[PDB]
Amino acid sequence: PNFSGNWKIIRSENFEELLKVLGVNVMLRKIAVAAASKYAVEIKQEGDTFYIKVSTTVYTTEINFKVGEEFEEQTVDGRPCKSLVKWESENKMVCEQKLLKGEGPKTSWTKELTNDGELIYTMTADDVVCTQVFVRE
């Protein structure tokens, strides 16, 4: 497959429940949900190498990685972590994360290209999975 493209969000589910696990107070959670409802994903994929830019109205971040090679990013709620992406099938990848300091919930994320042309992104913290769905722009 090829994940490359400009992706716009059409669904975002269980995001407040995720942020609750991470301690975020309710008012910041509501404002974060609103921000998540808007955001966009740009992917450039060359073989097993990915460049991913995620942006909302006032914030943007770039993620660079090669499948199977450890890299550093930040957890969903902002703490720096070591990450490692592996394929689970032709069109889906899974990222496991480990905190660089302290402890927290077990966090991870997945990205999947469906046969109907959707991009599905999930973020997990313990038992709580947030699911977001995108379509090409």
Swiss-Prot record:
Impact upon substituting residue 29 to A: Loss of ligand-induced nuclear import
GO annotation terms (biological process): embryonic forelimb morphogenesis; epidermis development; fatty acid transport; positive regulation of collateral sprouting; regulation of DNA-templated transcription; retinoic acid metabolic process; signal transduction
Motif interval(s): Nuclear localization signal: 20-30
InterPro entries: Calycin, Fatty_acid-bd, ILBP, Lipocln_cytosolic_FA-bd_dom
Record's comment on post-translational modification: Sumoylated in response to retinoic acid binding, sumoylation is critical for dissociation from ER and subsequent nuclear translocation.
UniProt entry tagged with the keyword Zinc: no
This protein's GO CC annotations: cytoplasm; cytosol; endoplasmic reticulum; extracellular exosome; nucleoplasm; nucleus
Coiled coil feature spans: none
Keywords: Cytoplasm, Endoplasmic reticulum, Isopeptide bond, Nucleus, Retinol-binding, Transport, Ubl conjugation, Vitamin A
Annotated Gene3D superfamilies: 2.40.128.20
Pfam families to which the protein is assigned, alphabetical: Lipocalin
GO terms of molecular function: cyclin binding; fatty acid binding; retinal binding; retinoic acid binding; retinoid binding; retinol binding
Cross-link (Glycyl lysine isopeptide (Lys-Gly) (interchain with G-Cter in SUMO)): 101
Residues the entry annotates as binding all-trans-retinoate: 132-134
Location of the protein in the cell: Cytoplasm; Endoplasmic reticulum; Nucleus
Predominant localisation class: cytoplasm
Inducing stimuli: By retinoic acid.
Key word Methyltransferase present: no
Assembly and interaction partners: Interacts with RXR and RARA. Interacts with importin alpha.
Function: Transports retinoic acid to the nucleus. Regulates the access of retinoic acid to the nuclear retinoic acid receptors.
Domain-level remarks: Forms a beta-barrel structure that accommodates hydrophobic ligands in its interior.
Family the UniProt entry places it in: Belongs to the calycin superfamily. Fatty-acid binding protein (FABP) family.
Protein's name according to its UniProt entry: Cellular retinoic acid-binding protein 2
